[PDB]
Design a protein around this ligand. Sequence first.
Ligand SMILES: NC(=O)c1ccc[n+]([C@@H]2O[C@H](COP(=O)([O-])OP(=O)(O)OC[C@H]3O[C@@H](n4cnc5c(N)ncnc54)[C@H](O)[C@@H]3O)[C@@H](O)[C@H]2O)c1
Ligand SMILES: NC(=O)c1ccc[n+]([C@@H]2O[C@H](COP(=O)([O-])OP(=O)(O)OC[C@H]3O[C@@H](n4cnc5c(N)ncnc54)[C@H](O)[C@@H]3O)[C@@H](O)[C@H]2O)c1
Ligand SMILES: NC(=O)c1ccc[n+]([C@@H]2O[C@H](COP(=O)([O-])OP(=O)(O)OC[C@H]3O[C@@H](n4cnc5c(N)ncnc54)[C@H](O)[C@@H]3O)[C@@H](O)[C@H]2O)c1
Ligand SMILES: NC(=O)c1ccc[n+]([C@@H]2O[C@H](COP(=O)([O-])OP(=O)(O)OC[C@H]3O[C@@H](n4cnc5c(N)ncnc54)[C@H](O)[C@@H]3O)[C@@H](O)[C@H]2O)c1
Ligand SMILES: [Zn+2]
Ligand SMILES: [Zn+2]
Ligand SMILES: [Zn+2]
Ligand SMILES: [Zn+2]
Ligand SMILES: [Zn+2]
Ligand SMILES: [Zn+2]
Ligand SMILES: [Zn+2]
Ligand SMILES: [Zn+2]
Lengths: 366, 363, 364, 366
Amino acid sequence: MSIISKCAIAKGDGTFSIETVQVESPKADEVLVKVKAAGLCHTDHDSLNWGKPIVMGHEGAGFVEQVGSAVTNLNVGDYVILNWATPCMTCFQCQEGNQHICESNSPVTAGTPGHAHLEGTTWNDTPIERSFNIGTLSEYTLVKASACVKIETNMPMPSASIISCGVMTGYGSVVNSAKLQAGSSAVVLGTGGVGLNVIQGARISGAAKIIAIDINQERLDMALQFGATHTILADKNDIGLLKASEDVKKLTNGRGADYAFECTAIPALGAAPLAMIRNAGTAVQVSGIEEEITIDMRLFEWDKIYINPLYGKCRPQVDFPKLVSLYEKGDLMLDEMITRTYPLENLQQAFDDMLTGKNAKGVIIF
Amino acid sequence: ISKCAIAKGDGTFSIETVQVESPKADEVLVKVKAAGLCHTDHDSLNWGKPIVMGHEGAGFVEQVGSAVTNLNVGDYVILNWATPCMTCFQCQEGNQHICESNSPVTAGTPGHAHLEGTTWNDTPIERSFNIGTLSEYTLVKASACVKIETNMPMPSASIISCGVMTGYGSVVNSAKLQAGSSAVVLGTGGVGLNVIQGARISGAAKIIAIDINQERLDMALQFGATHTILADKNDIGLLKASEDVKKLTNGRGADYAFECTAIPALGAAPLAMIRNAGTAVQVSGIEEEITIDMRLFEWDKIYINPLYGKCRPQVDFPKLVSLYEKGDLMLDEMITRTYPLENLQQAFDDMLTGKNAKGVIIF
Amino acid sequence: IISKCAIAKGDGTFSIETVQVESPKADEVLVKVKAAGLCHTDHDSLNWGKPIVMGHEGAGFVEQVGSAVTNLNVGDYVILNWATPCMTCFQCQEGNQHICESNSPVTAGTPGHAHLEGTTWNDTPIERSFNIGTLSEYTLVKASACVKIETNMPMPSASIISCGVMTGYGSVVNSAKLQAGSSAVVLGTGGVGLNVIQGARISGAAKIIAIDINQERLDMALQFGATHTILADKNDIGLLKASEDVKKLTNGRGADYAFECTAIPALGAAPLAMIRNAGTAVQVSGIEEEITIDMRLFEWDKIYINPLYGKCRPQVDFPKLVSLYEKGDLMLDEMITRTYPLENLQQAFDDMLTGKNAKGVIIF
Amino acid sequence: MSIISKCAIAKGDGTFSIETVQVESPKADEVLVKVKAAGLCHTDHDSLNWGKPIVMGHEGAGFVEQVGSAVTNLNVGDYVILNWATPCMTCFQCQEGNQHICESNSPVTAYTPGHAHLEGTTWNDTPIERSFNIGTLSEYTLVKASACVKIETNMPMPSASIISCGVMTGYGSVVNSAKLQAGSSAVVLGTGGVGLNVIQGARISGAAKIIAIDINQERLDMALQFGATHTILADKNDIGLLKASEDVKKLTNGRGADYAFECTAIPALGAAPLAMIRNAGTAVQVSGIEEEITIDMRLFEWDKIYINPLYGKCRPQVDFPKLVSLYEKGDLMLDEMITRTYPLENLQQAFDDMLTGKNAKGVIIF
Ligand SMILES: NC(=O)c1ccc[n+]([C@@H]2O[C@H](COP(=O)([O-])OP(=O)(O)OC[C@H]3O[C@@H](n4cnc5c(N)ncnc54)[C@H](O)[C@@H]3O)[C@@H](O)[C@H]2O)c1
Ligand SMILES: NC(=O)c1ccc[n+]([C@@H]2O[C@H](COP(=O)([O-])OP(=O)(O)OC[C@H]3O[C@@H](n4cnc5c(N)ncnc54)[C@H](O)[C@@H]3O)[C@@H](O)[C@H]2O)c1
Ligand SMILES: NC(=O)c1ccc[n+]([C@@H]2O[C@H](COP(=O)([O-])OP(=O)(O)OC[C@H]3O[C@@H](n4cnc5c(N)ncnc54)[C@H](O)[C@@H]3O)[C@@H](O)[C@H]2O)c1
Ligand SMILES: NC(=O)c1ccc[n+]([C@@H]2O[C@H](COP(=O)([O-])OP(=O)(O)OC[C@H]3O[C@@H](n4cnc5c(N)ncnc54)[C@H](O)[C@@H]3O)[C@@H](O)[C@H]2O)c1
Ligand SMILES: [Zn+2]
Ligand SMILES: [Zn+2]
Ligand SMILES: [Zn+2]
Ligand SMILES: [Zn+2]
Ligand SMILES: [Zn+2]
Ligand SMILES: [Zn+2]
Ligand SMILES: [Zn+2]
Ligand SMILES: [Zn+2]
């Protein structure tokens, strides 16, 4: 059995075109997922500029169409949130509980056995790769079972999809990485797909003061909606947001916030959470920078914890169900995150709306 | 001259008059506008000597001591009973709540104002927990005063002095409750409802309220509970309530459980409500001898009996008013009734019989 | 394959016997046992009402490896563990492999036991104690019971890692997270408590006060890392006089950490008497009885915890323990009082009952 | 009562001369210390090119000569280890326990309270500062009572004096700042005054691997004496110590060490501990860098705690007695540290030997 799927294919020239791909039947450890909605992340745009053909998409949710012989805890028709940890569960990092940095199956750490067998998905009869081992921007996906989280809820499929990246890295960086203490102060630099979810984490965690900083006013109105207490509108020409840092310091009685989160997608702002933070504060850079930047090392000075975490320290079988609860409870808002849905043929307009500043998140729906 | 409620070692209280001296150099004269009630004030009658009752209070600074730098006449203050010295072992560890020299609990004393300061008849009498808040005017050590620059209801600020701090802090400062977790509160009263608030502020996804009175249970839902359990008096060690708790937690148990029923015989009951490797926080404080089945402790369970929610008064108190100003801490709703000093007995009855979440004595 | 094994009865007696141990299935492993340490839990196994191949402490060589166990090979060197973690359940994904809800011989009792007719006595299948049953020439265990190690060290000293060393060292290092420069008190300096002393010594405790009724145990406590000793009286209830001696050596106040490992249920709350307000009290023994506790002793920020097997994550913890031994800081050799033939197992009990032997290892 | 005191004085120009200062009698919150031994830290050389006359010295110990009328817990003749925290015990940082980054009194993080009155020490009729509030390279130093920790022992004074900075920051970085856990792997970049005490702290904490790296074979020889298990000789052209970093990964199963500590006084090596570290490890640069540097941010990538701690999170009344207790037990080696004692006049040679690597620690004896 081979199935044909329309999908978004990125080519290795900065370009993406809707194509069709051939999805084989699941192997014993794999699962064929009918995708109902695929959310879009800033990393998905970056994927075009990677130099490989890939099935784009790393935020997805849907239903289990087929299951393999070895998979035992999930069934045809089951409702499944996709994750890109693909944890092997046995390696050194997995035994520390760091399944998000798995040494053998992570798409980031190992680039694998978190990917499904390559012949499972084919583009003009040449095997191609599922981005982050899941390639959600696709009618069907053949992934391994570690990529699936079963939830049993009537939650909207667009709301579910966004947990696969934006919501998890945002919330988990706050809760799992920084381990933000209730009653503290937090600064968020970049209230976008991730940063807005940082705010929900800070809000849900009990932060008393949540300082949203962005260059776009709509983004900031979004930050107010999702929990922010104070708003600062940064000028992009301000290098390192040092001028914003003085404004934060006025909001924290001279000394700075207790916590600060980077998620601007600007490599130059890598150190800028250090500028916003009190000595002994914790500075979390969520973006991920792979370039060579210059840092005034005075910003590091004086017991400030700095971490570049991945995927909010995600343990998908454990974290995803916790996020689902807070939604049902009402403390996660993710229906309201979904500003627009797009047909896969309109992915270009979706990319444009994420970068222009007009969407909290965009979900392609099938 | 001040109207104050004096406890008598015979076990009775009587409104009565005391004369208060001007402040010494490191002391503050605080006119009390509100004196919240706490369970231990009831047990403070059952102590063996006379005192000035009260360990929850708030007011304005009528008079300031010569070396007191950070406060001024007319400032607004919430009283705290930690009165930390800032120099002993525990204080340098950061445990200002178990101050080895000034604490009314662990050194009971410096940190209590000069004894001449409050005289009844002509015998100097002690202020309860060093502050004696059930008084019209109190003289106290400066370390027992926490200034606020916002303007909030005086009954709201007074309850911060004990119930709010112990309950919130046991969640935040002691248990260090993590978001997404399941919470069980045994006894949802003045401490218990702020445990719940502490749970909801910290982000708990499930908050199970167990209580023998439905009107608190109703209060518990007002203040953030997600599930309510009406226990029965004769459920020894609350075993049957444990079983419904585990039914609500997929088996296992809760990740956190909190005891504050004031019953000595339920001191291990948190361990029954909670999963292995969970953290059980007994808050009521038991000085009695009880029998415990040590199969409840078993398998990585973290037990603790913290005091005053690990209170560092000049840090946690400003935090609590910020979350009241944000709207996450509910304290105006917790003042079910205000009472004058003379109607104090009706206030114990309303608290002890479930009719108050918290009762405050206003001046 | 025939295995001469110690088989416990429900009555309270044992006999040496012979059993067939079948070839390994896909997820399980056949181990030729070279050394099996002993404890009072093995004596308890006679009390329990079940036929059982006894032994929960083991080290050996792999003789047979199943189709799906490609992470170790034949001839590899293997320290056995009794957590047998399933690796995917709630506690395993929290990092609590020692309290696995699906495979633990304690918390689940089962997967984590090899397939039942693997080891058969006459033709009735018999369980291996704690899913491992090490007092046997050959044992069939899941691969989870096996931790490859890659040092040429003496098998007997490898066998005491399987229990006394992991629970004692781990009660200090993982469960208490003992901070260098602190004061430690150890109540019961025996099979468990000597590796609690060893664990305080490696973590940097500045003052380690050993308390025990036997003078021989105290001397062997100094040898294993202690700095102070106090001799204790059984007539002391709650060790309250030993607690006030502890307060003299700890500036008033108490010790920053204390540890229960005496085997006495009436002593369950004693570490709390040993400890300053806001210290941490660790009850390593496990008490399945109801006792009376003076509740003032919990009062005031004292962390009280009874942990299992020292928070064991065997594939993680065991290699680290092997590394400290290689470094000289961890002492396993001097901990083995005497070696005994399986056929002289009653000797061992006998000498454990008397208190002659801190630990006994049966070597094949 | 004005005492004359021989001392070392840095002049702004990088030049040091022994001079005499008139040292005034103690005010109510002050203590006058007859310094008996004063060790040399790398920071004192740097203290030369600060553009201000200064009485040098921030490692020191002695006996109390005169006590102020408010000082109640110190008496003439007491044996005092000096510290440079001088904590006020009530500001925001002190009340979180961070006495070493005191907002009111720290010489680093705030002339300041915690310095004696300016008329107390004068050079040529003009008031002068004491470096790090204590200026220990002087026969007598006037300091605040909070500079003083009384020890009730009979330790060698040279051995007690190096606690004032070198031992405290190196051990503290491991125990207090990094909270190093036993059985771990640990890499130390620079085995000098701070780095050898890093190794001691790693050894007292129970590290299973302590890998020592330096460009000087003799200082590598010292690390083994104080606790290192493996040793890597790096070259001075190894930019960022990346090949040193390959040897480390060879020693740590290819993943990297759990912990790595940077104390080379070389700014470009600020990010080097990240290169020594496994993902989710903790990297600590104790040096302290004031210049801007260039950093490839994939070195931060993936859960890596980075922290620039000050003074090993020293609470001097709490930490200094633990150090003395661990000297009694034998596990802090610090008689061995004092490779050389010098007169005040041969400070230059003490400087020269610290910088050449011929000393572990060198102490000026008065
Ligand atoms: N560590 C991880 O696991 C992980 C996961 C997901 C995404 N990311 C990365 O996080 C970053 C953000 O992701 P996203 O989906 O939220 O992107 P996004 O484009 O949707 O949001 C970025 C926000 O940053 C704002 N911004 C840009 N420059 C700014 C400036 N100078 N000052 C203030 N705000 C500024 C933008 O206006 C926007 O609001 C990306 O780099 C992405 O690759 C990392
Ligand atoms: N640790 C501290 O520092 C500290 C501080 C303040 C108060 N306390 C103590 O906490 C305890 C409660 O404090 P409070 O002011 O809220 O008193 P309270 O009377 O308001 O609370 C008592 C609650 O216990 C509940 N209860 C009684 N029996 C129960 C049972 N079998 N099962 C379930 N619930 C039961 C009742 O519903 C009642 O609401 C007291 O013992 C008090 O002394 C301790
Ligand atoms: N929690 C776990 O996972 C785990 C694992 C293994 C063992 N254990 C238990 O830990 C306990 C330790 O037993 P063990 O292996 O060390 O056997 P053991 O006989 O060697 O240890 C008991 C020690 O306590 C001493 N002692 C007796 N009375 C004392 C007293 N009043 N005061 C001070 N010391 C006294 C004894 O003389 C002896 O030295 C056992 O109960 C064992 O079942 C628990
Ligand atoms: N943060 C604080 O509180 C604090 C405290 C004390 C010292 N310091 C600073 O720590 C740093 C070290 O202090 P120190 O007294 O140990 O200096 P030191 O000169 O005595 O020791 C530095 C060692 O690092 C070695 N080294 C130099 N370059 C190297 C390289 N490329 N690769 C490997 N090793 C190299 C040197 O050979 C020397 O052995 C100084 O910069 C000092 O200012 C900071
Ligand atoms: Zn993404
Ligand atoms: Zn893995
Ligand atoms: Zn109270
Ligand atoms: Zn104190
Ligand atoms: Zn055993
Ligand atoms: Zn498991
Ligand atoms: Zn220095
Ligand atoms: Zn301060």
